[PDB]
C-alpha positions as YAML, in Angstrom:
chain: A
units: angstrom
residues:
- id: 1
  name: UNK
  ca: [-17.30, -22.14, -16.67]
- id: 2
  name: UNK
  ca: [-15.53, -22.71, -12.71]
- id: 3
  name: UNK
  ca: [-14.22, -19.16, -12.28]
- id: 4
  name: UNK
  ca: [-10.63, -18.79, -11.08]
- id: 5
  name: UNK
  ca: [-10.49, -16.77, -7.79]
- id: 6
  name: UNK
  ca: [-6.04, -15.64, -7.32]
- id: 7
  name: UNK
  ca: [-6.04, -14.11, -3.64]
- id: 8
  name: UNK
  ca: [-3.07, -11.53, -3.89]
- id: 9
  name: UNK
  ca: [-3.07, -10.64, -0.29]
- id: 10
  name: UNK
  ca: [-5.72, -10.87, 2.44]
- id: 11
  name: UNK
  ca: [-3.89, -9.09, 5.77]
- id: 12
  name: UNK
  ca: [-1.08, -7.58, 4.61]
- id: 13
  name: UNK
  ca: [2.86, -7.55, 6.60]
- id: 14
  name: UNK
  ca: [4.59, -6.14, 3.01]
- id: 15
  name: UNK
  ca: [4.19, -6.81, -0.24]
- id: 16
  name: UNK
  ca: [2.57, -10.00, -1.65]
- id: 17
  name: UNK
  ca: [4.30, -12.68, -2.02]
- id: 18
  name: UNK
  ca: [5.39, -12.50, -5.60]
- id: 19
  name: UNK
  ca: [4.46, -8.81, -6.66]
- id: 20
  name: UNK
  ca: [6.75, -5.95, -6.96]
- id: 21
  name: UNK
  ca: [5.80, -2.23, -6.33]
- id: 22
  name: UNK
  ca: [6.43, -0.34, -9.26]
- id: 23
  name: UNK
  ca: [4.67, 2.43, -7.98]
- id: 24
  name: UNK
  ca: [5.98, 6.01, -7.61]
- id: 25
  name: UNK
  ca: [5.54, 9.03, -5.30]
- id: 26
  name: UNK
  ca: [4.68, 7.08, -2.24]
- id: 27
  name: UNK
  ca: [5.70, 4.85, 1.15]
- id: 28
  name: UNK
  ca: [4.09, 2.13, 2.06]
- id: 29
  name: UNK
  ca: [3.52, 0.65, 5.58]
- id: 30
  name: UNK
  ca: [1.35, -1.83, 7.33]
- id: 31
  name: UNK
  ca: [-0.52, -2.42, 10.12]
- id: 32
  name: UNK
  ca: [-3.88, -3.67, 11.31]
- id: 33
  name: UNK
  ca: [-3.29, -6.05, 8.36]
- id: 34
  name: UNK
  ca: [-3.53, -3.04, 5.83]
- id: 35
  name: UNK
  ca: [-1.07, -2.19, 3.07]
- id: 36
  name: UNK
  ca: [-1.31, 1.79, 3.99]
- id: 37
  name: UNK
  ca: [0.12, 4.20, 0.99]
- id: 38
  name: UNK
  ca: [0.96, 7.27, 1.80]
- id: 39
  name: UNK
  ca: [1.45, 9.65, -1.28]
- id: 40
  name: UNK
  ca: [3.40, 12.71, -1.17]
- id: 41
  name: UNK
  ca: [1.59, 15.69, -2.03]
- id: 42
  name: UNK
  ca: [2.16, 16.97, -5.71]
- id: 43
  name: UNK
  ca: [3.53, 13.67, -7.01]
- id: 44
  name: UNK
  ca: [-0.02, 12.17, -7.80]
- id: 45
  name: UNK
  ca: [1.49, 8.95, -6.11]
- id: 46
  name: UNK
  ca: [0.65, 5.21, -6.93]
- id: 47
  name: UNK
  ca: [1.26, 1.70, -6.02]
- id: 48
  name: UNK
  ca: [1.86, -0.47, -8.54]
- id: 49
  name: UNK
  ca: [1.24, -3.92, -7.71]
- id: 50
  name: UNK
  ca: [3.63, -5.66, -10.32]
- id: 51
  name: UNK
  ca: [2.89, -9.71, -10.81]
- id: 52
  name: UNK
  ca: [6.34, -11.55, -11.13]
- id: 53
  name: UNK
  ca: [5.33, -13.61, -13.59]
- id: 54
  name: UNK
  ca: [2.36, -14.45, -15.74]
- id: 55
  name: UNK
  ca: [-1.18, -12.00, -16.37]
- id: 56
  name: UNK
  ca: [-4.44, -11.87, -15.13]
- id: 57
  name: UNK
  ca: [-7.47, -11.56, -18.33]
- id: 58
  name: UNK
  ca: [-10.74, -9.30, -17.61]
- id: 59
  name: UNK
  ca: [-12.63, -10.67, -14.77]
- id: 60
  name: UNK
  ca: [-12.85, -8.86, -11.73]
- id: 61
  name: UNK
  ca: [-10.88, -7.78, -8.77]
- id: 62
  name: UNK
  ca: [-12.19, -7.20, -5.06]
- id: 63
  name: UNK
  ca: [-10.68, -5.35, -1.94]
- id: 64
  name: UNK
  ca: [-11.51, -3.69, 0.63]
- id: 65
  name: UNK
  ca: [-10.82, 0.16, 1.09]
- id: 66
  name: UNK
  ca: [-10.77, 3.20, 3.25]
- id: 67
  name: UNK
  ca: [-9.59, 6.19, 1.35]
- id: 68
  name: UNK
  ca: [-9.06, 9.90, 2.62]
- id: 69
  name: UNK
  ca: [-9.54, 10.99, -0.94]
- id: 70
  name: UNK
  ca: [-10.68, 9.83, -4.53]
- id: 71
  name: UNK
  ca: [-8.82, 6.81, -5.80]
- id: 72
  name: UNK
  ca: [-8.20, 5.50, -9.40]
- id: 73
  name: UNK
  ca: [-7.93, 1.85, -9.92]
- id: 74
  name: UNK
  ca: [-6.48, 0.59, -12.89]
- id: 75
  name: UNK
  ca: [-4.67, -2.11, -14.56]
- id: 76
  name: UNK
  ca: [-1.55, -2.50, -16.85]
- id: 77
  name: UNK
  ca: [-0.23, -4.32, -19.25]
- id: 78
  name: UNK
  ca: [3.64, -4.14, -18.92]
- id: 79
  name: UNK
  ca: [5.14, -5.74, -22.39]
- id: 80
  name: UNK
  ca: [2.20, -3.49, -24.32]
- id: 81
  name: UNK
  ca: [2.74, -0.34, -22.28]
- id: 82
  name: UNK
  ca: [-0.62, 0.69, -21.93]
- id: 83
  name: UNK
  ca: [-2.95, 1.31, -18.52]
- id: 84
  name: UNK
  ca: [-6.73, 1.09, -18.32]
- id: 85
  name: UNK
  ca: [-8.89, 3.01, -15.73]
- id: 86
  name: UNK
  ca: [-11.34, 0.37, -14.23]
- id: 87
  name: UNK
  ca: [-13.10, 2.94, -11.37]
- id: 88
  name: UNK
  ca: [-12.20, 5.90, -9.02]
- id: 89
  name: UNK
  ca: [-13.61, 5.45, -6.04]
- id: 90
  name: UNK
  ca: [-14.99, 8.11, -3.39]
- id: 91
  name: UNK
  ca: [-13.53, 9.05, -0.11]
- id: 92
  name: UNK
  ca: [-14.92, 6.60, 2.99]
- id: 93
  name: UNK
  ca: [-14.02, 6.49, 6.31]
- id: 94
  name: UNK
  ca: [-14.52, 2.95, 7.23]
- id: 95
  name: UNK
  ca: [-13.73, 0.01, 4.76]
- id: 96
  name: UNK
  ca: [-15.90, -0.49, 2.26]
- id: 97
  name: UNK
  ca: [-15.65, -4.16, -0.15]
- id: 98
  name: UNK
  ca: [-15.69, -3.25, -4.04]
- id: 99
  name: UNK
  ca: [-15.84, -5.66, -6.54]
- id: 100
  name: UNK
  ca: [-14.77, -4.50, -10.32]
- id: 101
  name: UNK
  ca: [-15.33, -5.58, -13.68]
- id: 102
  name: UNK
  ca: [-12.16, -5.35, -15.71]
- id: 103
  name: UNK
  ca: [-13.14, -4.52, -19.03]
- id: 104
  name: UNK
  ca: [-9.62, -3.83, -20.67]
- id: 105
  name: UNK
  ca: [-9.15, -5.95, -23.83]
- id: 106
  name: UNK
  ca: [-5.49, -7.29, -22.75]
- id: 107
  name: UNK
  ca: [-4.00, -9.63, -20.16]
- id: 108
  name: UNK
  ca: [-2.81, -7.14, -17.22]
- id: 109
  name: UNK
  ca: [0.15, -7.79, -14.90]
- id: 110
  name: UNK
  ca: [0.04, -4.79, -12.98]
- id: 111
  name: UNK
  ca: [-2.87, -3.44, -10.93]
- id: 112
  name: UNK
  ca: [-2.93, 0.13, -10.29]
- id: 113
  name: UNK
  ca: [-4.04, 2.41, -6.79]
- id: 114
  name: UNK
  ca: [-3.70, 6.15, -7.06]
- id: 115
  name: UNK
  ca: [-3.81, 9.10, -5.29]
- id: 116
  name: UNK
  ca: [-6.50, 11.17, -8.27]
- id: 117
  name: UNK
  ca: [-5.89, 14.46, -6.31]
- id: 118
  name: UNK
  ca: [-2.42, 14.38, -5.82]
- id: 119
  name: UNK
  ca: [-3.17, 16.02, -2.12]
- id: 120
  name: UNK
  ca: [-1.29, 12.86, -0.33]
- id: 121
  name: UNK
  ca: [-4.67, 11.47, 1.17]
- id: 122
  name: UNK
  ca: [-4.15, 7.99, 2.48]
- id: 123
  name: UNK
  ca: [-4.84, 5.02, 1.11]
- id: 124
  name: UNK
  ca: [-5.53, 1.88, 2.95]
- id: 125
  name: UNK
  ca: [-6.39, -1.93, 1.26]
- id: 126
  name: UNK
  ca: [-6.81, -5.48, 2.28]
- id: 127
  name: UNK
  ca: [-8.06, -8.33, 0.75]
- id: 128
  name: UNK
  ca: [-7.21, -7.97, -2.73]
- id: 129
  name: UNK
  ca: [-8.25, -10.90, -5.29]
- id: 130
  name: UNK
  ca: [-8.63, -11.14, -8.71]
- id: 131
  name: UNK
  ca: [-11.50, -13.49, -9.91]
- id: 132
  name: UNK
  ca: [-11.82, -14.61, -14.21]
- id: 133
  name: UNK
  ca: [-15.50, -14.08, -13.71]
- id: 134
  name: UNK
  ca: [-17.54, -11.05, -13.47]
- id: 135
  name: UNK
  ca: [-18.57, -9.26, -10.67]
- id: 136
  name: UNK
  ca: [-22.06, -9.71, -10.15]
- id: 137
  name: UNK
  ca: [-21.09, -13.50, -10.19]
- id: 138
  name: UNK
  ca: [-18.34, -13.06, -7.68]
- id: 139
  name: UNK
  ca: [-18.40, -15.45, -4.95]
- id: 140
  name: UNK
  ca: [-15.96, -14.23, -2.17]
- id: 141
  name: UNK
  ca: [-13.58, -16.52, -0.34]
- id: 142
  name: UNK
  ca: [-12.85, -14.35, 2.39]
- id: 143
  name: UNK
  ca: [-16.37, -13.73, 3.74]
- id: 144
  name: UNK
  ca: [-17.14, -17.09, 3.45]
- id: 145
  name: UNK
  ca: [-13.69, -18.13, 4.81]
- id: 146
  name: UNK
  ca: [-15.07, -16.25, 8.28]
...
């Protein structure tokens, strides 16, 4: 099957065009083309990127990230109330490009970034896109859009 590739954001100015934050315990700026979350100390702060309407199913999602401390992505199903941890991800200093398999049995309309250590380590992601096929069959559209 002709996977479905959904770019979310590539450089960032504020949120994407139709997502909501419904995130907690952070603020949120951007530069450099970055969506930058701050989380306050304590609060275990995340963004939650909310789709306006319709789900995403499985597949995979790719960003890019630099991260001053661990990160949990995961994904949510609003109407079912129920989250799914799809990776936490080590601190780097530079951006690094993951691509994740989303093994969660339900549709998801949220996707999930979160400060695991609740220390308020910054958080910094571009390029977000959600593809219907896996991840070792991920073909990116942004590197081969350079």
């Amino acid at each position: 099957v002709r996977a479905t590739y959904t770019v979310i954001f590539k450089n960032a100015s504020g949120l994407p065009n139709g997502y909501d934050n419904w995130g907690w315990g952070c603020t949120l700026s951007y530069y450099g083309g970055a969506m930058i979350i701050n989380p306050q100390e304590g609060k275990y702060g995340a963004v939650s990127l909310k789709r306006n309407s319709g789900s995403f199913r499985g597949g995979s999602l790719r960003f890019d990230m630099k991260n001053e401390g661990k990160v949990k992505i995961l994904v949510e199903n609003s109407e079912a109330d129920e989250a799914f941890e799809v990776e936490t991800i080590s601190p780097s200093d530079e951006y690094v490009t993951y691509i994740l398999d989303v093994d969660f049995d339900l549709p998801f309309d949220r996707i999930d970034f979160q400060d695991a250590p609740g220390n308020g380590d910054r958080i910094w992601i571009k390029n977000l896109v959600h593809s219907t096929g896996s991840a070792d069959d991920f073909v990116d559209p942004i590197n081969l859009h350079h």
